[PDB]
C-alpha cells in the first residue's frame, strides 16, 4: 500500500508512528483535524493522574488500553486519532506518544510552509530592524513560506548576528570575523 | 635577531587582537544591508 510521505522525515518510533498517521490522514484529507486532535490528546496525556496511569509498568495492558479507549471516547475523536491511540496503547508505546505527537506537529510545521529561523545577537535588538530583517529574509524563501523568528541574545558574540534560516547558516557576528582575520595575520 | 623578532611579532599580533576586544547600530543596519546584498 503506497504511502503519502511527509515533506520532512522524523526517525525512530516517533517518526514511524508520525509518518503512519500523516500518510493515513493525507489519504482522507483530514490533516488539520488530526493535528488539532493530537494537540488535544497530548494535553490530555500530560494530566497527572493519567500520566501516572499510562507510565505505570505493572498495570496490565488490557486495562490500560481500555482506559485509553474510553478516555478517547469521552472526547469524540476522529477514527484516525482513536485508532492511533489504540495502536499506541496496544503496542506499549504510550510513553512515546507526546514525541509522536510533536513529530506530527513538526511535520505539519513544514506543511504550512513555516520555515524556522533563529537570529542570535549580542544585546536584545529592537523591533524596527526586526521587521527590516523579516522583510529581507522572506526574500530568502521559495514559493509561499513564512518565517518563524526566535531572536536570541548572547553577548559572547559581542556584536554582529548569527542567522540560522532553516539549515542555512550565516555568521555575521564580529567574533568570527576577528578570529578569521587574526588567523590570516597569523597564517 | 630572528627569534627575538618572532617572539615579539607574536606577542604583538595577540596583543592587537586582544586590545580591540576591549573596544554599534551602524553595523547591525549594515548587516541587514549585506543580507539584502546577498540576492
Amino acid at each position: 500500500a503506497k504511502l503519502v510521505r511527509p515533506p520532512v522525515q522524523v526517525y525512530g518510533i516517533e517518526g514511524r508512528y508520525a509518518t503512519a498517521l500523516y500518510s493515513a490522514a493525507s489519504k482522507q484529507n483530514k490533516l488539520e483535524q488530526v493535528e488539532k486532535e493530537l494537540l488535544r490528546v497530548a494535553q490530555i496525556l500530560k494530566e497527572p493522574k493519567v500520566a501516572a496511569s499510562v507510565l505505570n509498568p505493572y498495570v496490565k495492558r488490557s486495562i490500560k488500553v481500555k482506559s485509553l479507549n474510553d478516555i478517547t471516547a469521552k472526547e469524540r475523536f476522529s477514527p484516525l486519532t482513536t485508532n492511533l491511540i489504540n495502536l499506541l496503547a496496544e503496542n506499549g508505546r504510550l510513553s512515546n506518544t507526546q514525541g509522536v505527537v510533536s513529530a506530527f506537529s513538526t511535520m505539519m510545521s513544514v506543511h504550512r510552509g513555516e520555515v524556522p529561523c533563529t537570529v542570535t545577537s549580542a544585546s536584545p535588538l529592537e523591533e524596527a530592524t526586526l521587521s527590516e530583517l523579516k522583510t529581507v529574509l522572506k526574500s530568502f524563501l521559495s514559493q509561499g513560506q513564512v518565517l518563524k523568528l526566535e531572536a536570541k541574545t548572547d553577548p559572547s558574540i559581542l556584536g554582529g548576528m548569527i542567522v540560522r534560516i532553516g539549515e542555512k547558516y550565516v555568521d555575521m557576528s564580529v567574533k568570527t570575523k576577528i578570529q578569521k582575520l587574526g588567523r590570516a595575520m597569523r597564517e | 635577531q630572528n627569534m627575538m623578532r618572532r617572539k615579539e611579532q607574536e606577542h604583538m599580533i595577540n596583543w592587537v587582537e586582544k586590545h580591540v576586544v576591549q573596544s554599534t547600530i551602524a553595523k547591525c543596519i549594515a548587516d541587514l544591508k549585506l543580507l539584502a546584498k546577498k540576492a
Binding site: 556584536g159 564580529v174 570575523k177 576577528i178 582575520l181 | 604583538m12 596583543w15 592587537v16 587582537e17 586590545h19 580591540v20 573596544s23 553595523k27
Partner: peptide, 15 residues
C-alpha cells in the same frame, strides 16, 4: 569594517 578598524588602529597603536 571591524577588523579594518583593528588593523589600522592597532598597528598605529603598536607604532
Amino acid at each position: 569594517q571591524k577588523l579594518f578598524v583593528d588593523k589600522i588602529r592597532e598597528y598605529k597603536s603598536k607604532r
